[PDB]
Every structure is written in C-alpha cells, then in structure tokens.
C-alpha cells in the first residue's frame, strides 16, 4: 500500500496496514517512509 525503507539494511518494500512493523528482509524494527514522488519547488533565494 505505502512504500517503506528499512532503517538497517536500507531495503525498500511496501506495507498494507496489516503487516507487523518490521523489515521484510533483515527483520529490523525501525523503518522510514519513502520520499513522495510529487515535485517540490524552491525559489533559490
């Protein structure tokens, strides 16, 4: 459902609000939300 990245092995996966909060590959208990795909604008000032 939502992309996530592991905090230890840095592997990208996805979650569907049903899986336990853990890394699929290395079983790490700390994960981060992946960066959104939307563009971001700055005024360079």
């Amino acid at each position: 459902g939502v992309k996530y990245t592991c905090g230890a092995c840095a592997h990208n996966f996805s979650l569907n609000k049903s899986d336990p909060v853990r890394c699929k590959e290395c079983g790490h208990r700390v994960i981060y939300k992946a960066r959104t795909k939307r563009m971001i604008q700055f005024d360079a000032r």
């Binding site: 905090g7 840095a10 990208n12 981060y32």
Partner: protein
C-alpha cells in the same frame, strides 16, 4: 559544511578554488602563498577560503538510507 559559492562580503566566486587550494597545500606551500597563487587579494576572500571547514567529508561517512 561545503565551500561557499561566493565571498560573503564582496561576492567573488570562490567555490571553484577549493580543490586547487588543497592541492597547493599538498606540496607544502604556505597558506598565504597558496592564497596568493589563487589571486585572492582582498582579505574577505582570504578569510572565506582559509577559515572554511569541510564538514561534508564527515557526513559522507555514514551509510546512505537508500
């Protein structure tokens, strides 16, 4: 963090002389001589280049999160 693009006071472009400054310091040249060879006359640019701390070299030590 990283070398600034321009001198804060005057505005001379000094961001392209960091690698040259380090290489000049490699051959044992004094800091004043190295600054002189980079044509940094006004002491604003001299303090811009001389007092910079390259902290980004530390930030690159940590493993990337992706």
């Amino acid at each position: 963090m990283i070398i600034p693009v321009r001198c804060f006071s005057c505005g001379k472009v000094v961001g392209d002389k960091w690698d040259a400054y380090l290489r000049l310091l490699e051959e044992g040249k004094q800091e004043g001589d190295a600054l002189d060879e980079l044509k940094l006359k006004r002491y604003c640019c001299r303090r811009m280049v001389l007092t910079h701390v390259d902290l980004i070299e530390k930030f690159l030590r940590y493993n990337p999160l992706e």
